[PDB]
């Protein structure tokens, strides 16, 4: 792919299901000025991904406190995303979301980020930390069965922000 | 770039390492078939963030041994540089005695194979790779230089891959 540490993260423009339940076309560049956590999950209506998606959504305020936007993505259609959002949580659904969920039906965003599982047209569990200038700072890719940690993601975002500011602090 | 792809054999290498007993030995990734491997790069010796990471993995090597997991560190520095850093006591800014081997990659080919060579600076990013007992790459982690890695998170991942290896694999 085109995701390289220290280089601009690949832009994308894609339809997402937004927290209000409506569809909107969004771009990574919409979020310049904020840190971004951009994470891929394989498919809707699965059993490892909902733990991650719900954790990032439940804890969205902790990312907001770090001026950090979280965005999820999968190759499944935006209609499929909303169907899972609208599935009651007690039946295995996501429930209302605090983060947008991008649809990548052409697989070009996963390819751009180097996380397409080519023999099975879905993304690996890629997670990318992009700074406020659009520069890629961190790459995480898990094989399909193993999920990610919101605690670890917050540790990384905060640490990148602290090290960003080091030489810019008052010299008193 | 690089040849490190999830679900494919992790790129083999054969290189000089400083072993835990303080002596040089030429080792290969394939030496560790039958065990999980955590293989991690750091930018160069005698630095300031890297020793904290190296010493943390070394100090906690027994937690990986309990998981039948070998930890291996690497950088582009010469094998003599590694030994001098080990031979410098921790209280004077060195590593002190190590429980993990440290691989030397002076031709930069291992860093290139794993896709973590930083262009025109001749050093690796903070790459970390989880390789299963069959030699297959399961996890990719790459941090930009200012932010270190977590032993807790690495153990979480190794444990999670070993957990999911227990159910549903092609050979009963
Ligand atoms: C007329 O234009 C202006 O006033 C502009 C601002 O717009 N100031 C400006 O250019 N200062 C200059 C000339 C240029 C910038 C530097 C060299 C670098 C930072 C600086 C050492 C420094 C950093 C940290 C605080 C400081 C004092 C505090 O009371 C405090 O709370 C904080 C947190 C001081 C100690 C005040 C002086 C300081 C700002 C100087 C002085
Ligand atoms: C499949 O080959 C056979 O069963 C032949 C008869 O044809 N038996 C055979 O060699 N038995 C022996 C001698 C004895 C039985 C054991 C020790 C145990 C299972 C085994 C590790 C094992 C399990 C799972 C697959 C395997 C290879 C594949 O290509 C595959 O798709 C699948 C799903 C392999 C890796 C092939 C070797 C394997 C069968 C050996 C070898």
From Swiss-Prot, chain B:
Its EC number is 1.11.1.24. GO terms for molecular function: cadherin binding; identical protein binding; peroxidase activity; RNA binding; thioredoxin peroxidase activity. The active site is at 50 (cysteine sulfenic acid (-soh) intermediate). Residues 4-163 form the Thioredoxin domain. Keywords: Acetylation, Antioxidant, Cytoplasm, Disulfide bond, Isopeptide bond, Oxidoreductase, Peroxidase, Phosphoprotein, Redox-active center, Ubl conjugation. PROSITE patterns: THIOREDOXIN_2. Phosphorylated on Thr-88 during the M-phase, which leads to a more than 80% decrease in enzymatic activity. There is a cross-link at residues 5, 118 (Glycyl lysine isopeptide (Lys-Gly) (interchain with G-Cter in SUMO2)). It is found in: Cytoplasm; Melanosome. The modification Phosphoserine is found at residue 30. Its main location: cytoplasm. It comes from the Eukaryota. Induction: Constitutively expressed in most human cells; is induced to higher levels upon serum stimulation in untransformed and transformed cells. One of its GO terms (cellular component) is nucleus. GO terms for biological process: canonical NF-kappaB signal transduction; cell population proliferation; cell redox homeostasis; erythrocyte homeostasis; fibroblast proliferation; hydrogen peroxide catabolic process; leukocyte activation; natural killer cell activation. The active site is a conserved redox-active cysteine residue, the peroxidatic cysteine (C(P)), which makes the nucleophilic attack on the peroxide substrate. The peroxide oxidizes the C(P)-SH to cysteine sulfenic acid (C(P)-SOH), which then reacts with another cysteine residue, the resolving cysteine (C(R)), to form a disulfide bridge. The disulfide is subsequently reduced by an appropriate electron donor to complete the catalytic cycle. In this typical 2-Cys peroxiredoxin, C(R) is provided by the other dimeric subunit to form an intersubunit disulfide. Belongs to the peroxiredoxin family. AhpC/Prx1 subfamily. Homodimer; disulfide-linked, upon oxidation. 5 homodimers assemble to form a ring-like decamer. Interacts with GDPD5; forms a mixed-disulfide with GDPD5. Interacts with SESN1 and SESN2. Interacts with FAM107A. This is Peroxiredoxin-1. It comes from Homo sapiens (Human). The gene is PRDX1.
